[PDB]
Amino acid sequence: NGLTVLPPLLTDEMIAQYTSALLAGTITSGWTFGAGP
Amino acid sequence: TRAGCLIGAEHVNNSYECDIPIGAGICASYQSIIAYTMSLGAENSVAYSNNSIAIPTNFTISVTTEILPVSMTKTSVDCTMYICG
Amino acid sequence: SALGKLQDVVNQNAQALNTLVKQLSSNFGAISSVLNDILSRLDPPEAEVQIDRLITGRLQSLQTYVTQQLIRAAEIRASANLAATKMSECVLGQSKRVDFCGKGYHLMSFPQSAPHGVVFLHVTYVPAQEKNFTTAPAICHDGKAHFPREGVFVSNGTHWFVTQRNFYEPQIITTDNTFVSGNCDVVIGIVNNTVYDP
Amino acid sequence: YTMSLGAENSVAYSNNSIAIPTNFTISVTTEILPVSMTKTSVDCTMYICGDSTECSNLLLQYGSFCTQLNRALTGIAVEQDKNTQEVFAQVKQIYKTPPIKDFGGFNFSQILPDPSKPSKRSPIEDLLFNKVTNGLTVLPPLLTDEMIAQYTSALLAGTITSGWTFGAGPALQIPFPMQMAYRFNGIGVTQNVLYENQKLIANQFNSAIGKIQDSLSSTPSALGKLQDVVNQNAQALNTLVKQLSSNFGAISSVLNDILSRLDPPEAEVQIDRLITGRLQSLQTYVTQQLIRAAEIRASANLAATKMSECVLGQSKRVDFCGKGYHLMSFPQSAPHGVVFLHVTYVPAQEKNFTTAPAICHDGKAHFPREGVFVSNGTHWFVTQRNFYEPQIITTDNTFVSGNCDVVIGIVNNTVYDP
Amino acid sequence: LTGTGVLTESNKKFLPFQQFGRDIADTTDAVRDPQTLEILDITPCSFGGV
Ligand SMILES: *[C@@H]1O[C@H](CO)[C@@H](O[C@@H]2O[C@H](CO)[C@@H](O)[C@H](O)[C@H]2NC(C)=O)[C@H](O)[C@H]1NC(C)=O
Ligand SMILES: *[C@@H]1O[C@H](CO)[C@@H](O[C@@H]2O[C@H](CO)[C@@H](O)[C@H](O)[C@H]2NC(C)=O)[C@H](O)[C@H]1NC(C)=O
Ligand SMILES: *[C@@H]1O[C@H](CO)[C@@H](O[C@@H]2O[C@H](CO)[C@@H](O)[C@H](O)[C@H]2NC(C)=O)[C@H](O)[C@H]1NC(C)=O
Ligand SMILES: *[C@@H]1O[C@H](CO)[C@@H](O[C@@H]2O[C@H](CO)[C@@H](O)[C@H](O)[C@H]2NC(C)=O)[C@H](O)[C@H]1NC(C)=O
Ligand SMILES: *[C@@H]1O[C@H](CO)[C@@H](O[C@@H]2O[C@H](CO)[C@@H](O)[C@H](O)[C@H]2NC(C)=O)[C@H](O)[C@H]1NC(C)=O
Ligand SMILES: *[C@@H]1O[C@H](CO)[C@@H](O[C@@H]2O[C@H](CO)[C@@H](O)[C@H](O)[C@H]2NC(C)=O)[C@H](O)[C@H]1NC(C)=O
Ligand SMILES: *[C@@H]1O[C@H](CO)[C@@H](O[C@@H]2O[C@H](CO)[C@@H](O)[C@H](O)[C@H]2NC(C)=O)[C@H](O)[C@H]1NC(C)=O
Ligand SMILES: *[C@@H]1O[C@H](CO)[C@@H](O[C@@H]2O[C@H](CO)[C@@H](O)[C@H](O)[C@H]2NC(C)=O)[C@H](O)[C@H]1NC(C)=O
Ligand SMILES: *[C@@H]1O[C@H](CO)[C@@H](O[C@@H]2O[C@H](CO)[C@@H](O)[C@H](O)[C@H]2NC(C)=O)[C@H](O)[C@H]1NC(C)=O
Ligand SMILES: *[C@@H]1O[C@H](CO)[C@@H](O)[C@H](O)[C@H]1NC(C)=O
Ligand SMILES: *[C@@H]1O[C@H](CO)[C@@H](O)[C@H](O)[C@H]1NC(C)=O
Ligand SMILES: *[C@@H]1O[C@H](CO)[C@@H](O)[C@H](O)[C@H]1NC(C)=O
């Protein structure tokens, strides 16, 4: 009746990839990746 | 109660954590339905004196969860189709 | 009920959609809630009035739905700004802010994706198995007052030591872990103990 | 007039002069934050229609508008209790102060609960509670004022007897002149400064607490932030009451007059006009109540952040917990609000000194380990940055890096060796 | 009963006093053909946001 659900721009696997990148950064590099290289 | 009259709950003198809030310090729980004044917390008297200190000798690595919502479902409504079809 | 915060948002959005769909079944004072029935039963001079009643009712319902959707969007935006702050300060660094990144002394944090949400696993340090000690603000030695550089003077009953504040690690009170400021006449509660010199 | 922004203060800047404080003021400031509102509930059916069954039969044609209004008001009502729970119930242990109030000269009688009062409030909290003055129901708050005062008493006992340790785990007791020294070291001032001047700091703290009580007792507009919330809620309820006296184009604002003066074919039209007018009024009231509930929730989240970061710990954030270098904070309950007494350190009685970045000695550059090189005109010393305490420049308070050819502005002075 | 839609064979079994079926929004989602007594679902014709 005119209602639509727009899909999100980031899918769940890409959000999971972002969280995996954050986990890899904070495990292998500490807080250094959040402030530079 | 200060919230009003409560019929069907047995008032007890013990204090528990709030399960179903009634109001004005009254809470209800199921164990029959009981009503009670809620307990803010367990009592604890800190052993203060002017020349004594407490130093930890051990530690616990504690991991806790924090859940935070980020987005909602993106809903769009065709206004002309919703009103008129 | 661990994930109740996300399920609350999902239930509120689904209930708002269900209410908006349910509002089409109301006639709002017209003869019928179906537009085709009015258009097949009535001439346009009175069908215009019935359709006008249906239009103003459905428009009021839609404006109401958009109003609480904007209010919930503001609430979710505030929660998402909080989540971005927690991601910046607890995951990408170590935070000195108390109870911002869990209960206890915050060590580090892990982000986890969740349906329309984020879950932070806060790894924190909790002190445990505390023990009483007799403490003093300063040590009087050779007419001089000695204060700890980073720790605290403790005594187990007969002997005086200096330890770090958040963990019991007794060390001999030396000139290397203490500093000298003034005499013993000023500090209230100064005690007499020797200070070793390496 | 054209308004002025403040007094012009040309700071005496030069490339080799510094200003070092020689004294301090223990300053206590008040911060008032609203936490919750009055929990209001509206019977939508009785507000639109009262006891008229024909009005409710016509109101059923509009569907579930009343259900949405009741659910929105119920959400606001439980949100207020959630706000109070997040602000005040940050500890699950109810701490008490010891019966002997020996805190090294520090007086907390104006903020600790008074045993002589039946409400078990502090004198400051008692003054704060004295300074705040058709289908409609007011739901009582879930936490009474006595239990909010009990929560603030537990927080005060924890932060007095145990430091910030109770906010991070078990409450570890510590003497208050030691807790204070730890707070002094958190803002970068050495423990000795606190210990040597402990009587003066205790006297300044007691004088500031008394000035806080006098300023609250002498200013009528001190608690205006809570009073604005109370006045807005009462005025919105009064407007919602006064909207019932309007006919909205009908022949009368009373449903009984229409039902007694007219037949149902035209009374249906007049009642429909009254229904849509009162429904529009109720939707307007619920919308502005939701907006104000969002504002109060934001203020309560801020208040919970200040409770966690200023009371349960020492905060490095500038101006988050008062003006100046934050030492500690004390919570006080207020009617639908919280009052934080921020105890801060303000530097005072500053003095000019001639300063240098490094000391050249034996072809080596010496830099201060924790302080700064100062000179009174003839002799060079090293002192801590936030308080003037001159010490002899030794190898124990300096470190060596490079020669004297690199650092711009290095001066020649001896460096003593113990 | 006028409308616009796609008529499909239905698995719903109407009682003999029933002629049509309504959904949540009180639109006719199922109808009995008055000549051959069979039930038909009425799906709305496909609408897609552009
Ligand atoms: C440190 O010493 C104090 C005082 O001796 C201890 O506090 C007492 O503990 C006993 C046992 O729980 C209680 O019965 C007393 O009422 C407490 N006294 C006070 C004044 O609180 C405290 O337990 C000791 N700390 C540790 C870790 O043993
Ligand atoms: C500090 O606490 C840890 C536990 O958090 C203690 O480790 C336990 O030691 C006992 C006896 O040695 C073992 O039976 C347990 O299995 C150990 N637990 C774990 C998780 O390894 C440790 O002994 C404590 N140390 C002190 C000095 O008290
Ligand atoms: C406080 O701690 C000190 C050091 O740990 C203890 O001194 C030692 O005690 C043991 C056991 O009697 C002796 O074998 C050592 O020779 C002591 N060392 C020195 C340098 O004297 C002391 O006994 C402890 N006091 C209490 C009351 O437990
Ligand atoms: C700590 O040591 C100081 C100095 O050794 C003691 O001060 C002396 O006290 C005696 C008697 O109380 C006096 O006759 C001396 O004149 C004091 N000396 C000085 C330099 O003032 C002090 O009493 C000692 N304290 C303890 C608790 O043993
Ligand atoms: C440090 O020295 C400077 C310069 O000698 C002082 O600045 C002067 O202060 C007086 C008194 O307010 C003014 O009349 C001058 O105009 C100021 N000069 C400049 C260049 O700003 C400063 O007051 C001294 N600091 C202290 C704490 O006495
Ligand atoms: C630092 O400031 C304090 C005030 O905050 C000074 O204490 C005052 O000293 C004067 C003169 O000695 C007395 O008349 C006052 O009664 C004192 N006030 C208090 C509250 O004790 C102190 O003298 C200052 N010290 C320095 C070195 O400037
Ligand atoms: C702590 O502060 C309170 C209040 O500032 C002091 O109580 C005052 O005591 C004096 C002398 O005994 C009386 O003249 C005042 O009327 C009291 N004021 C109040 C409000 O009761 C108290 O003496 C201070 N010290 C201690 C140790 O409690
Ligand atoms: C700068 O401070 C130093 C030390 O505080 C002062 O040196 C002392 O000055 C007094 C007064 O003339 C003498 O009695 C001492 O013998 C000096 N001590 C030493 C070690 O020489 C110095 O005078 C101060 N300079 C100024 C300009 O005030
Ligand atoms: C600080 O000391 C250095 C070395 O002791 C001085 O540098 C000397 O300056 C004289 C005259 O300019 C030269 O003849 C020497 O060759 C320099 N020696 C070195 C090692 O560079 C410097 O002038 C002194 N600074 C001040 C302000 O007196
Ligand atoms: C601590 O209190 C005792 C009495 O309870 C007293 O004798 C002692 O001097 C006090 N010490 C300090 C540092 O206040
Ligand atoms: C500071 O400025 C003066 C001139 O105003 C100059 O002679 C001196 O070398 C400068 N010092 C530094 C460290 O820049
Ligand atoms: C005519 O309609 C009746 C019921 O309305 C039905 O039983 C019969 O089969 C129909 N006949 C034809 C030829 O459509």
- Of the candidates C18, C17, C27, the one whose C-alpha atom is nearest the C-alpha of residue C58 is C27
- Of the candidates D365, D332, D306, D378, the one whose C-alpha atom is nearest the C-alpha of residue D127 is D332
> From the CA atom positions of chain E, what is the Rg in Å?
12
Which ranges constitute the DSSP H helices of D243-308? 255-261, 264-306
SS3 of residue B23 by DSSP: strand
**Is D142 touching B (CB cutoff 8 A)?**
yes
Technique behind the model = cryo-EM
Resolution of the entry in angstroms:
2.7
The kind and range of the H/E element at C64 are: helix C44-86
Q: Whose CA is nearest to atom 27 of ligand 3?
A: C157
Contact state of D150 with B48 under an 8 Å Cβ cutoff: no
Contact state of C22 with E24 under an 8 Å Cβ cutoff: yes
- Of the candidates D293, D377, D347, the one whose C-alpha atom is nearest the C-alpha of residue D36 is D293
- Of the candidates D201, D232, D195, the one whose C-alpha atom is nearest the C-alpha of residue D336 is D232
Chains D and B touch (3+ CB pairs under 8 A): yes
Beta-carbon count within 10 A of D223 CB: 22
CB D31 within 8 A of CB D339: yes
Per-residue tokens: D92: 């699950």
For residue C25, list chain D residues with Cβ-Cβ distance below 8 A: 63
Contact state of A23 with C113 under an 8 Å Cβ cutoff: no
Residue type (1 letter), D43: D
Give the separation between CA D273 and CA D249, rounded to whole angstroms.
7
Query: What is the number of the ligand closest to the CA of C131?
Result: 1
For residue C25, list chain E residues with Cβ-Cβ distance below 8 A: 24-26
For residue C94, list chain D residues with Cβ-Cβ distance below 8 A: none
Using a 6 Å cutoff on CB, does residue C197 contact ligand 1? no
Dihedral pair phi/psi, residue B75, rounded to 5°: -105, 135
- Of the candidates D120, D94, D97, D117, the one whose C-alpha atom is nearest the C-alpha of residue D108 is D97
Per-residue tokens: D397: 């308070």
Contact state of C127 with B71 under an 8 Å Cβ cutoff: no
- Using alpha carbons only, what angle is made at residue D314 by residues C75 and D333, rounded to the nearest 5 degrees? 60
Residue of C58, C116, C166 lying closest to B70 (CB–CB): C116
HSE-CB for D155 with a 13 A CA cutoff: 29
For tokens 């009087």, name the residue.
C140
SS3 of residue B28 by DSSP: strand
CA distances from E22 to C32, E28, E30, E42 (A): 14, 5, 7, 10
**Is B43 touching D (CB cutoff 8 A)?**
yes
Give the separation between CA C17 and CA C21, rounded to whole angstroms.
6
Dihedral pair phi/psi, residue D56, rounded to 5°: -70, -35
SS3 content of chain E, % helix, strand, coil (to 5): 0, 35, 65
Using a 6 Å cutoff on CB, does residue C156 contact ligand 3? yes
Each residue of C96-113: b (16+ CB within 10 Å) or e?
bbbbbbbbbbbbbbbbbb
For residue E3, list chain C residues with Cβ-Cβ distance below 8 A: 36
Using a 6 Å cutoff on CB, does residue B62 contact ligand 2? no
Dihedral pair phi/psi, residue D400, rounded to 5°: -105, 130
Give the separation between CA E11 and CA B44, rounded to whole angstroms.
68
CB C54 within 8 A of CB C24: no
Give the separation between CA C82 and CA C67, rounded to whole angstroms.
23
* 3-state per-residue secondary structure call for D174-227: CCHHHHHHHHHHHCCCCHHHHHHCHHHHHHHHHHHHHHHHHHHHHCCCCCHHHH
